[model samples]
Target chain A: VAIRNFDISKISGEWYSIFLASDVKEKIEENGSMRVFVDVIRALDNSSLYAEYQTKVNGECTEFPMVFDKTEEDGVYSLNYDGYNVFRISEFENDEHIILYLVNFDKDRPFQLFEFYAREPDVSPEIKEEFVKIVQKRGIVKENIIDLTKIDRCFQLRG
Target chain B: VAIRNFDISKISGEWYSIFLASDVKEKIEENGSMRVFVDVIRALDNSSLYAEYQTKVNGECTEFPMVFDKTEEDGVYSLNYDGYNVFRISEFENDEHIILYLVNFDKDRPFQLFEFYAREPDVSPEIKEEFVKIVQKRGIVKENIIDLTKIDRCFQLRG
Candidate 1:
């Protein structure tokens, strides 16, 4: 379920990846050991969110920016990069933790991507359990949530 | 210094005490070994916040609720319980960590209360150092910030 009355402005900040769930075969293989850092900023007009995602590939850090357009739903947004992607804030606990659901409609078979974000790279086991509960509540399979805690391959960003 | 455009809603949720600085004679003497858990919630109208402070005293867990009224400053608040107190968001890293300044002005000699909050009771050495830096920035003496990490008195709250 999408979040209601979600404050988009409060969502803008630097987030560290904790877990990722995706069914795309190529994506699963390539992002196995990669840690991701996401920096999100609100547009001046509050019409969209500018997101910069940084991750390591081949022992080199790379960055890419994406623009997200707000949808009719309060916590839902659409983005066009590789394809038409729908992003929704499935779950969030204040500014500390957030769960994003991404659906890509480019391929013949649409695949879903679930990402868990936190302020710190390492979270307590209790926080991990909370994320798992949210993933299950969103109709995502339990086996799909990949623990990215041990995968520390990205550059650390200083506040 | 107070935080600019501090979002009070983002500060809601359970926070584990990592450090505390208090000058009240009784508070300093009896609360030296006590650990605290703070759970904050915002009111529906967004005019005030309700905070539940749980701590171990005399080998038992105790909780008390305090209501904070929003001040003219964005993240600053005022509370009147046992005394007139001003609360300010001194420093925060998203929701992972927060430093709260509570200055009580009821006694003949007013004193400051500085508290460091984190998502977990235990944080890394790096995070602790960062909290120390912020404490210093607020003009609080280094010796005043008590190390409460080793004093695990309160019951852990599940996510």
Candidate 2:
């Protein structure tokens, strides 16, 4: 289940992807790790959101722009991508940690991707444990989740 | 889709889990990597199969027994575990590389896991690339698939 009465404004800052769970099928042959950064900016009208994803593709760090359309439900937005993508805030811990779920709709097979984010690059062990417990309780397979905490690679977004 | 004609006997030998994709929540905190071995044995009746999984849990390796019940589909097997688990031989190539998908059914949310297996502990880059392509074609998120080839830890199974 997703968080109730979620606030979109609270999730406008930069978030570091600490852990990720997805049904993606591709594999990377390179030795480097992947780092993800989500930057959400509220529009002047406050009706839509500009979500920019800074991620690693191939061997380079790139940015992808996504427009999030507000849905009828609070904290739920539809990603303006090629296909149907639903972005929802599943968990939030007082601005310290946030968990987001990206659900992609397919005709025959639908898949979900879980992203565990933090305000800072480094989070406390207790907070990490809390995030782990939340995902475990949601019936996520234990071994499928990748911990990106120790990877030295990170997003180099210039101010 | 599952393999059309899967030979259970041909897949009876020992297989190593080289790569895995899952939504499992728990994270392995230690530095050690995980190794999984699947030993499939044919029952005397020649109708049933006994599958044993040897994997690491908390620093030690543990074994879990599972009975695979043949389904109406050719290469799909229903796992006789506590929960509803569907095991399918999604892909197999001349015993060199095998891909298994374990789909767990939850009341509200269901998840699928992809396990790339090989007869030997090490596999060729081309073979690994093939496996990655297959999964990528299936819409698996690329980074979510863990490459266990570089890890030195492996299962030491005995007869």
Candidate 3:
């Protein structure tokens, strides 16, 4: 179930990606459109959302800052992602972590991405274990999970 | 995130198990304690829940009728399974289906189970796909998934 008590604004600032996984591995692989490192998520007008995602693409640091329109459904958003998105907070802690799911609807093949983001770059093993356990249940394998902590973010961590 | 628009009473009719998975592979395997089929769920006194789960054990049908005490939190329940359980409705569609999560906190070895149940025995591919997709995201693998449809349930499915 998607997290219900979620307020997007609570997750607005200074988040770092710790792990990423997807049904279509390439969707979160290096250069994969969804393979992103986060800088921040902005709650705009108490309505929509915007995010800045950086990645190491072909050794070039690139950032994708995109805006999302809130859907009629609570906690679901639509984004012009290349053009699309159902973003869900699957698990959350006040200031510690969030396990999020992203669905991108491309005309031909729809795909999903699973992510673990933390307030800071260093995350506990217990946290990773929880995230790992959650992803495997969705059929996302260990092989497909990228330890984003190992990747050098184009946008350096503030803390 | 656990399903919030959930009420245990709504799940009180005949429910059939479709798929089961777990982090510890053997937890849902044949002869596993968590490997069981359902008959019906009861919403007792509007404060507690009851369920009849049947399984083929030692070639004989055994039914485990259990009661659950609703916790202080909404949609969370506690039941005695050798005395224990955190149960959640992870995905729900009114009369169609429910994707459930069961965590058993054994003092020695804690384990969790992922379940897919339907109002009917015959489920659509799309439903299973959604369940599979969700479980995989949690780190449950294909090998751990048991297609209960193939298992001859000791308690026959009601059409």
User: Highest TM-score, which number?
Assistant: 3
Which candidate ranks first by lDDT, i.e. highest? Answer: 3
Predictions in order: lDDT: 0.61, 0.57, 0.69
In the order shown, what is each candidate's alpha-carbon RMSD?
A: 20.1, 13.7, 10.8
Q: Model 2: how far is A135 from its true place, Å?
A: 17
What DockQ does candidate 1 score? Answer: 0.01
Model 3 Cα lDDT, one tens digit per residue, A46-159: 598888888777988877688877644455555666535545553354545777666553423445577787888869887777767777765567888889888787755322
Docking class of 2: incorrect
DockQ, candidate 2, vs. native dimer? 0.05
lDDT of 3 by residue, B1-159 (tens): 233345455677888889888877776777888888877887889688888888777777778787877654455555667425555553454546777676554423445577777888869887777767767765566788889998777754332
Residue B80 of model 2 has an lDDT of 36
Query: DockQ: which is higher, 1 or 2?
Result: 2
Ordered from best to worst DockQ, the candidate numbers read 2, 3, 1
DockQ result, candidate 3: 0.04
lDDT by residue (B20-121, candidate 2, tens digit) is 765441221132222355644444364567767766666666676667776444565556343455556644556556777665543234455677777787
- Checking candidate 1 for backbone clashes, the offending pairs are none
1 versus 3: better DockQ goes to: 3
Predicted structure 2, TM vs. truth = 0.45
Query: Which window of ten consecutive residues has the lowest lDDT sum in model 2 chain B?
Result: B25-34
